[PDB]
Amino acid sequence: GFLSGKRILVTGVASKLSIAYGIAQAMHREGAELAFTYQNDKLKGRVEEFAAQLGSDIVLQCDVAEDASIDTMFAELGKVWPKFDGFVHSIGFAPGDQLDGDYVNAVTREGFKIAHDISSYSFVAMAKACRSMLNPGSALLTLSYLGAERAIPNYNVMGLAKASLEANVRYMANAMGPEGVRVNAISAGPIRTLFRKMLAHCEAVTPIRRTVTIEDVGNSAAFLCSDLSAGISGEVVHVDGGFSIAAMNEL
Amino acid sequence: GFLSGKRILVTGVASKLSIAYGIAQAMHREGAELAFTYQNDKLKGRVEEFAAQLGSDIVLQCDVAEDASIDTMFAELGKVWPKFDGFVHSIGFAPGDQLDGDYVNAVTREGFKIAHDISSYSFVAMAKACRSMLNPGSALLTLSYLGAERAIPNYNVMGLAKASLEANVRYMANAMGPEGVRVNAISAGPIRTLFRKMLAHCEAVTPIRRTVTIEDVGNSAAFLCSDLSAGISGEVVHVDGGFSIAAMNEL
Amino acid sequence: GFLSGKRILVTGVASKLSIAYGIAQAMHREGAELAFTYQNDKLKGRVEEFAAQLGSDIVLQCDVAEDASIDTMFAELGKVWPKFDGFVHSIGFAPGDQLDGDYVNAVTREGFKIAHDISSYSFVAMAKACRSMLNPGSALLTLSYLGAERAIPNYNVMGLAKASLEANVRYMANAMGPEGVRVNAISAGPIRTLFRKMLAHCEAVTPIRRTVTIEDVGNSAAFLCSDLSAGISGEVVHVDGGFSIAAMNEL
Amino acid sequence: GFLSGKRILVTGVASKLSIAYGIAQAMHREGAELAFTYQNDKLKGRVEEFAAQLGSDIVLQCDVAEDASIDTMFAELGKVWPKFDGFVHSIGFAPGDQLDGDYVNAVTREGFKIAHDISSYSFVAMAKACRSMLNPGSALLTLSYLGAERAIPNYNVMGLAKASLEANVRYMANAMGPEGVRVNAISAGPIRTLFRKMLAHCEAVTPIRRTVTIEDVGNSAAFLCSDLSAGISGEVVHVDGGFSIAAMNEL
């Protein structure tokens, strides 16, 4: 595969429906050696299983909310991968209360803090802790959403976090590019993961007349982390069937 | 003046060089009734002096880092302005050690936290606190910079915070539009305030062949807060002499 | 008025509903001295009538489809306005058969040709013709629409022409900036002029909860052509109530 | 390869340095059957040669300036490929005089016409003439340049053409997407093809600190025309090493 000989760490794999799962699935298919992380014990076993299926026994725990945790995870990873070629950041979160109803009423300083810390800072936090471990040609990838570019109902504060994240991508790519490291993000269209009325609207108005799948994303992700996309960095590639580039298709 | 009859609150005045300062005068010239805030004991003096010059004597203390300080400030403002027509958010801060050198190495979880909190959340926290006090036809304005759309050396984490802020503009605009509130931002070009080699560069490659002044920004601010801009909301108006829409002008 | 002392040329007035019309009044209210153009024998009458109402009696013929017509018009304008301060370009046209049904099937090489020629080249052809007549501090303005940034049903080729036009704005702004000329565009939201189901939709999903008026556009136009916008050039200001910065509002 | 079983027509191959050449090179490597076109006789032989090297004897002539020519080319193609899966549009041109010096002085109505007809309309012209021949899952790709988004010195009218082209991409993707056809473009960074001082500037300021190669582009092109990018349509993927997402790196 076009990922043969690459070593990629994959975060955010919670189930078979997780985008991270579809990405891992596709990267493995292309010959990449994988390593996974899991937030907490409630998933350790379940995650080790998905890992086995992809020829991996490198299942490390990591809470990106804690620097010590991230450092510890990369220390372990180091034991088996003194060097690797990048990682996939598939982490997003905001206290439930934040995601429903009028944005201005819902948002809270604390809600804002957490959503930005976890959904945006953790990305650079991770790059920061494994920077000396990256081989030339490595690639870092994160997942964003249209809520960052446009004001979407109920998405609220998660929208500001994604925008912060999309800028993090540009600053990260600009800082690390000189040492042979590329950084990008994939703005995926809506998908059904760990709303239904929405996927309905999306399907009818999206150009390809269907919502994207973790497979469609997995393939773009694999591409974006392979040498095939060597000329791409700091980009936010839209993988939403062209949903965002059209308007008033509903009418 | 096209602002006569409008009661606008102006934050961030620090000195005659301040942007909020250039904005206050322009708004004053156009006939607006102003209120001023000051962050601490160090600035109160200078803020009252300037306010006096612009016919105002409503100088309230406020530290956007604290919700209580914001509620209290708006409580005091209520005694004199039961209702008003918007406010200018000219507040931006990142711990010094953050805006220097390689971005990935300078940024830290705390610096990131403070930057976003003071530069982005403070804007909506303020809208939160005075939402009921706003008259239909009110307008909210904040100041952003190009580091939000593109990776600019040394601007580092502020770039992420400004992006979060420009997204805030969109969400706030979308949430408050129904009750008659517009929300926009001015992405101002560089201005020497409270760097020389950068200005020299900008003046040479900027279409109008000079950097913008707090008067230029001031006039655009007065406009964005007057009923003349009634058809603009959730927008980021570039007031940088067209610098950002050009490329490779140095050559 | 913030336009007193300015001599501005306004093209495209066709009726009291016309956008250029809403612009002429606003500019007049603010104290601008205006000149008017008319395309053919069918419109001359109505244009002179309106001009008279706004204190002007400079009604010149001009068909932007012909370079000679443009040179001649500016030659006549020279007799009364040796120099002036800019002009409003409110001209847009595509052969009828182009704006209906599937884009790929409707478009044709000729329709494409005419659309771009009348909607985009005419703007710079006009700047060409009067470049020496423009005073430092002059401003040029054109009108665009969202179909330039996103694919909108039935707008078809006009969408391509508007994009060419918005790019023209940038190049013209960059070329003329050094001699003191600013060049901007207003991307106006939909307005019923010389479609009902579309408006109903827009009013519901637009942040301010209504479609913009030629007054809204008019006031923003006066501003973009006054020295108040001295810090804005090569910009595309969205005057659509924030419609474009929202997404999935229907749901 | 990930293009196994796909049939792609490739235009714009003029030499070994042509981007089209690097794209063909990479698509062939991935198992795609190719077909080529050549503008005029002066290239027939030379193009047939490049074709042989890629297992192709399908070398058809085609002047995109003429509808009859395009129809004739697809008629021939039909004889050998009654059905295929998309094509690569690598065609750009503007009368020499147009590309140097102040844009406003250089541009001419005729210059504008040709540049837009050849560099932008031909893309949809081709889609139009082969629409019934595309299998579900087909993909159309065109090449754009940053000059479309920003005002670049000397690029002049070619900048407006590229913008028109980038919008054509969105409208084309929106119209054809429902029949299982995707349409995208690659905004490539500068490359040395059939200026030097510029590649210098680009290298020092680009994040990956180097200009992209026809190889880097060829790979993105192959990806964009393969089922791996099934979730991408109407997008303008930047393959310039992240040049456009950074600013003031020169300082």
Ligand SMILES: NC(=O)c1ccc[n+]([C@@H]2O[C@H](COP(=O)([O-])OP(=O)(O)OC[C@H]3O[C@@H](n4cnc5c(N)ncnc54)[C@H](O)[C@@H]3O)[C@@H](O)[C@H]2O)c1
């Ligand atoms: N599902 C969609 O519609 C969609 C669309 C576009 C982009 N995205 C983005 O893609 C990413 C993956 O989302 P998903 O849809 O696969 O959901 P998911 O719930 O399947 O996976 C997201 C992961 O968040 C991780 N997480 C949360 N807090 C964490 C913490 N403190 N430390 C470490 N890990 C933590 C969990 O382990 C989980 O596996 C997110 O960033 C999301 O915003 C989702």
Ligand SMILES: NC(=O)c1ccc[n+]([C@@H]2O[C@H](COP(=O)([O-])OP(=O)(O)OC[C@H]3O[C@@H](n4cnc5c(N)ncnc54)[C@H](O)[C@@H]3O)[C@@H](O)[C@H]2O)c1
């Ligand atoms: N000067 C430029 O080059 C430039 C360009 C574009 C945008 N901006 C933006 O414009 C705004 C004003 O900047 P400036 O150049 O006038 O600088 P300034 O230092 O003169 O003013 C900024 C204000 O930040 C306020 N502040 C910081 N923390 C605060 C807190 N916790 N509570 C209350 N107030 C607090 C201070 O009182 C200060 O007056 C900023 O948001 C800045 O990012 C500046």
Ligand SMILES: NC(=O)c1ccc[n+]([C@@H]2O[C@H](COP(=O)([O-])OP(=O)(O)OC[C@H]3O[C@@H](n4cnc5c(N)ncnc54)[C@H](O)[C@@H]3O)[C@@H](O)[C@H]2O)c1
């Ligand atoms: N009305 C809307 O919904 C809307 C929204 C956004 C932008 N716009 C843009 O604003 C501008 C004005 O449109 P309008 O709605 O006022 O329509 P309108 O028909 O009232 O006015 C447009 C003008 O086009 C002029 N014109 C066409 N070909 C010409 C030629 N060859 N020479 C000289 N003049 C010529 C006509 O004289 C006419 O008055 C257009 O460029 C349009 O694309 C309109």
Ligand SMILES: NC(=O)c1ccc[n+]([C@@H]2O[C@H](COP(=O)([O-])OP(=O)(O)OC[C@H]3O[C@@H](n4cnc5c(N)ncnc54)[C@H](O)[C@@H]3O)[C@@H](O)[C@H]2O)c1
């Ligand atoms: N070279 C760069 O720096 C660069 C960067 C980004 C994008 N691009 C774009 O990529 C495409 C390919 O350019 P290139 O750099 O490979 O140059 P090139 O000269 O090698 O190839 C371009 C092709 O234009 C074709 N052409 C011109 N007029 C034609 C007509 N009337 N009918 C049919 N074919 C015609 C020629 O056959 C030629 O092969 C262009 O659209 C260009 O604008 C070039």
Ligand SMILES: CN(Cc1cc2ccccc2n1C)C(=O)/C=C/c1ccc(N)nc1
């Ligand atoms: C793109 N998405 C999915 C999504 C959530 C959501 C909420 C409101 C509207 C749309 C929405 N979409 C598409 C995400 O990034 C997920 C965000 C998210 C969800 C729950 C949570 N606890 N933290 C973060």
Ligand SMILES: CN(Cc1cc2ccccc2n1C)C(=O)/C=C/c1ccc(N)nc1
């Ligand atoms: C736009 N600016 C000014 C600025 C800083 C900067 C750093 C690098 C490059 C450009 C830069 N510009 C224009 C700002 O927003 C200021 C941010 C700032 C500065 C110090 C501080 N302690 N907190 C915030």
Ligand SMILES: CN(Cc1cc2ccccc2n1C)C(=O)/C=C/c1ccc(N)nc1
């Ligand atoms: C913005 N508009 C109005 C408009 C047309 C249109 C078509 C489809 C969808 C929206 C649409 N809007 C807002 C225009 O620029 C008008 C273009 C136009 C109309 C007729 C014509 N003969 N030439 C040009």
Ligand SMILES: CN(Cc1cc2ccccc2n1C)C(=O)/C=C/c1ccc(N)nc1
């Ligand atoms: C991206 N490029 C290359 C290029 C030409 C050019 C001219 C001025 C400045 C930059 C420039 N670049 C990068 C192109 O699209 C080619 C355009 C082109 C060149 C010659 C020609 N006769 N027709 C079209």
